[PDB]
Amino acid sequence: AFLADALSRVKPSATIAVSQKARELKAKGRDVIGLGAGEPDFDTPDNIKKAAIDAIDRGETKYTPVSGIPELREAIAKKFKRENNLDYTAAQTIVGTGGKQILFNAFMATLNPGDEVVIPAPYWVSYPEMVALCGGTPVFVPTRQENNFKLKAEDLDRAITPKTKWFVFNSPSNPSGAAYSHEELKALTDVLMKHPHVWVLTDDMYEHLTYGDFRFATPVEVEPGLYERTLTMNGVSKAYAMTGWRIGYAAGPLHLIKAMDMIQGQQTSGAASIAQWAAVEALNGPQDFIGRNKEIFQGRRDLVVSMLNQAKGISCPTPEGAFYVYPSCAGLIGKTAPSGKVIETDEDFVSELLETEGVAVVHGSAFGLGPNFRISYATSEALLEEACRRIQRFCAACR
Amino acid sequence: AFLADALSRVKPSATIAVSQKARELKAKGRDVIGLGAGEPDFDTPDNIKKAAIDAIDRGETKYTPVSGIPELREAIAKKFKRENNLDYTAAQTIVGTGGKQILFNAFMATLNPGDEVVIPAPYWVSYPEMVALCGGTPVFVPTRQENNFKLKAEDLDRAITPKTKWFVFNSPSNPSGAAYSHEELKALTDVLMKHPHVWVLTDDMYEHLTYGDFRFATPVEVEPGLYERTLTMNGVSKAYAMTGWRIGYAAGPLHLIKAMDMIQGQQTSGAASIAQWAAVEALNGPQDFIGRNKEIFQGRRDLVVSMLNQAKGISCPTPEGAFYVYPSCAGLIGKTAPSGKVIETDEDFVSELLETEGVAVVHGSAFGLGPNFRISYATSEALLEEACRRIQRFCAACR
Numbered sequence A, B: 001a002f003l004a005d006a007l008s009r010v011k012p013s014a015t016i017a018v019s020q021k022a023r024e025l026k027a028k029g030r031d032v033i034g035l036g037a038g039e040p041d042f043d044t045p046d047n048i049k050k051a052a053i054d055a056i057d058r059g060e061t062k063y064t065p066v067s068g069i070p071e072l073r074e075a076i077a078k079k080f081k082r083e084n085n086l087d088y089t090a091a092q093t094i095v096g097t098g099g100k101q102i103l104f105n106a107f108m109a110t111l112n113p114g115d116e117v118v119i120p121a122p123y124w125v126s127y128p129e130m131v132a133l134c135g136g137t138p139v140f141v142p143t144r145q146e147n148n149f150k151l152k153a154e155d156l157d158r159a160i161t162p163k164t165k166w167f168v169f170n171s172p173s174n175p176s177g178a179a180y181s182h183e184e185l186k187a188l189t190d191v192l193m194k195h196p197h198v199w200v201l202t203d204d205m206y207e208h209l210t211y212g213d214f215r216f217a218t219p220v221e222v223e224p225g226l227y228e229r230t231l232t233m234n235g236v237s238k239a240y241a242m243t244g245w246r247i248g249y250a251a252g253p254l255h256l257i258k259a260m261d262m263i264q265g266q267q268t269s270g271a272a273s274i275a276q277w278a279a280v281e282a283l284n285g286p287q288d289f290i291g292r293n294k295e296i297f298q299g300r301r302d303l304v305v306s307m308l309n310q311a312k313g314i315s316c317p318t319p320e321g322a323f324y325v326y327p328s329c330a331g332l333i334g335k336t337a338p339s340g341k342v343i344e345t346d347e348d349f350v351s352e353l354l355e356t357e358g359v360a361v362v363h364g365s366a367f368g369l370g371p372n373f374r375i376s377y378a379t380s381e382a383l384l385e386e387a388c389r390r391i392q393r394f395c396a397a398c399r
């Protein structure tokens, strides 16, 4: 037909559908609280704004090298050494239009029909969509809430086959907020060292959003033996409240970086020049924003964890990173919502919650693990408190 | 293998190669004049820069709708009506990270194995690279310099087969600077009306760079019968000297725009927010920059054409738009260059010109039609004059 056969491999997005239903409820006058934000509710710090404005003033308005301006590729190589104790040259780095484009082109540069990509559940839904669009086969490995949504080494090992090309490792996790300690990650790298053909795609986007005394670690830092088959991907979107600017980056083996540069050159050429100069300042400038926001987010996390565990039938683990919680609604399965609807799935729970209380969350089965739902607490404490009060009232009314 | 088989369908780029030898020669201390620019030498106009700075100041730093902020999509729909007398709603528009991403995802959203894409030669080198990467088959149809590189209806009709899905229409053209009059375009749309399965991808990027009394016309304006199978693509890169900002756009039928949006959502999630607000001002603001640059560029064109036609063995047509000339070196084929090397191909002419005179151009066979070479006159008149003198000296020394 006219559209590519490949598009049929991509399942419709439950997350966009939730945003759409919420938007429809607000349009007809309902008081809706959205709990699906994927971006901080803070503006970009002034120092980053000023650097962008400076680049505009100087006339940095021309095409950049496809893989990034040299100032930013250098800043990225230094960040990987300074923050993650990894050794990359600037030539091993690539700047994309979002971390999204890094992941997309890593897959488009590598996937052939029959290639498998191991994706732990719950997963960010864009991961299997990209793999499927690029023609690969997602292979999902479920985690369990009793293990705080973290992968068991034995489950990772069973999922790997000679057809496995990639293992996607996202810590801290969207949607669960789970974050692997050094020792938890070492158990997984020990498995990967037993399957040397499997490349590792590590999504470190939420590196700087971690709570308490948790210490972030990335796969090649934990296992240097993974250096020649890992793409270490990160970005400024979450850490620096720069989601709109679209700057992500990665570092890895030269032959992969060259292949992604070739595809990126056909797709977008380099990322917006002004946004790249902004990202240079984000990485090289003062880092006070990071510490300030850890405290703000930890308080929001604590509020939501406290309130959700008071709700009838709800159980909420305490996450260690990112700004998501992944509570279970297992205690409400089989009960009758206020509307009369029998709650048979987490999708029923979430759609009844939205209609009855105007609180918009995403059901866990959309991310590969239920009966659960995701809440993003990247919004005000007043809105979180009001939304959790409504969730408490809704759950108490289920019979 | 680890890298995707699709990558092997893309031939290595001669445009990057020549840019490599020029950079290398410059490193050895040669005074190189580069005539392979693809971007205005002027900076982004101040009104656009100010709009960008305003957007930064007030915090337009969040994720946008994937297809673009509503202000820009509305500005695009209004531009297509005001400037091209086309009727599109804002829902029919899509904003991408460069015109490249518009073109790339038009193909990625549609191409299946065996789908053919008719590309007139000389062609922008990225067109067949995109088609091949996405699995399509480029089908080249040569034009003649005697027609100033404008396709004849009979030639278009002979290249269309039942497998043709796309016809790529780039006017004014990179590399040739040819621009089809309304009359000349009607000859091709008359053919396209007889082949209803062929969609039209019209790349109007150089719309606002035309000379003399020429009046730009776009296919759907010429033939409204093509409305339901054309993607009308354009951008701010060339007209507003915004190459580094990466904003391109298109309008077309909703079923294609929605497919392109789905793919763009997986790739970038939407263009840099600050750059979208700059492009709002580009389209809606004063257009004095366009008119000013027509005069400046026309004078550069006249200078380059006249000097090239004084170079021995060179024949330079007068382009109607863009900022390229596509002179023939047919008169030098078989002569011996100053080095003593016999010029067999235009690739030989171009590499000898670079090595002997330090002038960097791109050989015509890279664009599918020779013996020719492309010169960009988006550079100062002093540099064009000096480069053309060197070319004259080189050509005179060919025996």
Ligand SMILES: Cc1ncc(COP(=O)(O)O)c(C=O)c1O
Residues within 6 Å of the ligand: A038, A097, A098, A099, A100, A101, A124, A170, A173, A174, A203, A205, A235, A236, A237, A243, A246, A247, A248, B268, B269
């Ligand atoms: C886990 C994860 N990876 C990658 C991304 C991409 O972030 P961006 O493309 O905005 O830089 C996100 C954003 O939603 C994310 O949550």
